[PDB]
Copies of this chain bind each other. A is one copy, B any other.
């Protein structure tokens, strides 16, 4: 039994938001507004990333609705609200039995003046596998039409060919394209020169050569240290003219100091979560970041009293999600050794428990680090982090070392995600694959070296629409066709649950 969640007591101020500028003057004017803003701007990750990291993405539309309008009116200073993409699309269907499209429509109505930001995985939009180009373009068209205003487009290997088409589609739909560099490694560690400052500079130059409106720096594992953050942001600001959007996780406890370091260097936007859903593997707290910068040269653009009022509601509704809580959470600097993103951390822990190795999770994480080194020190983020996690699980579960796969390897049946990674299905890693180990991994199957979307089976939306209309009881909308293409079986199971249980999204949590 729970009391009603506390409702915020706001002090409303009418301002013109970035969403209003986008609606009236387009993406370039929004870019100018961000460029002309002296304060650092904030993107609230509460609706997507905060509960993806802390609550296994299980946060429901019903709890979102009770506070969405309060966020829209009480925090008009926000650059945007990250409310879509990531694991939310799949999790909604699969586990919450609510449509991500329905969530987007309801929030869009409730939040007219808030810019809606989505995490978009480049060639595999919200999936884990590459889709043909027209599928990606159609997804982007529907997402922009239904109210996504900002597309943070990233590729799990920082491979620009996998991002170009999505960036172009976002621009063609009159929305804001965020081209993302995934940060990994340590630019201040000379012993690790692969992802050095020059690598990021060149990548940022290439991304700016695209039409991307904003350059995002995505630190999926909270690897960006404060001095590293200041240096990287400074070098990027000297290399390109796009506004910078930094996104970090607080898993090592250094999120606030990293954000302040980037703010000194001139970052434009930083990703924050509400205090009650912040810290740990989630983003740094928005209230905390306000007080960190309060009397410095640059302030955080936010109504902190209103944010503290909103946080009471978020604190109350988090209690509904006790079964999905991770547990005791402390700052964890081991993330600097094993570069596992939080989602990869929890999923790997769960899989090790199901496998029956939870007592050896320490050497599981060591295997993760060594597997990453064996694959060639790859950027570990969805879905590339799944590859490393699966390989490490496989190598501990059958007691393999590096030499075991390098000499005995030709006999083992490596997990399919490792195989798919080494066939080039995820794209091309920086510096290419390790040729010998690639030969061991893919014994005989075909290996591609170009954009996997080129080799994607063609999809025609008319036949898919007719077939879906047969499979479900009615004529599907464009969003439903796009969902069926991305997650075929998941969408059908969701339709089955809709026919059998109805809109359970209306139930209170």
Contact = CB atoms under 8 A, between A and B. Distances in A.
A328 B319 CA distance: 9
A304 B333 contact: yes
B308 A318 contact: no
A227 B294 contact: yes
A336 B325 CA distance: 27
Contact of A226 (B188, B252, B277, B292): B292
A227 B284 CA distance: 18
Contact of A257 (B3, B292, B312, B318): B292
A252 B308 CA distance: 12
Contacts of A3: 359
Interface in A290-305: 290-292, 294-296, 304
Interface string A122-151: 000000000000000000000000000000
Contacts of A334: 308
Contacts of A444: none
Contact of A252 (B188, B276, B291, B315): B291
Contacts of A362: 6, 312
A275 interface: yes
A285 interface: yes
Task: Name which of A188, A228, A275, A315 has the most chain B CB atoms within 10 A of its CB.
Answer: A275
A385 interface: no
A188 B287 contact: no
Contacts of A308: 333-334
B225 A253 contact: no
A401 interface: no
Interface in A261-318: 275-279, 284-285, 287-288, 290-292, 294-296, 304, 308, 312, 315, 318
B330 A328 contact: no
A287 B359 contact: no
A434 interface: no
A275 B330 contact: yes
Interface string A329-368: 1111110100000000000000000000001001000000
Interface residues of A, number: 44
Contact of A295 (B228, B257, B333): B228
A384 interface: no
B253 A331 contact: no
Given A226-B292, A291-B254, A294-B227, A330 B304 contact: no
A115 interface: no
Contact of A285 (B292, B312, B318, B333): B333
Contact of A256 (B254, B275, B278): B254
A226 B290 CA distance: 11
Nearest to A274: B330
A260 B226 contact: yes
A275 B332 contact: yes
Nearest to A282: B330
Nearest to A288: B253
A336 B291 contact: yes
B318 A287 contact: no
Contacts of A336: 291
A334 B288 CA distance: 10
B227 A277 contact: no
Contacts of A315: 330
A253 B227 contact: no
A150 to B, nearest CB: 26
A279 B325 CA distance: 18
A278 B304 CA distance: 25
A296 B227 contact: yes
Given A225-B295, A253-B284, A291-B225, A328 B318 contact: yes
Interface of A: 3, 6, 188, 225-228, 252-254, 256-257, 260, 275-279, 284-285, 287-288, 290-292, 294-296, 304, 308, 312, 315, 318, 325, 328-334, 336, 359, 362
12 contacts: A6-B362, A228-B295, A253-B275, A253-B279, A254-B292, A256-B257, A275-B331, A275-B333, A287-B331, A290-B333, A312-B362, A329-B329
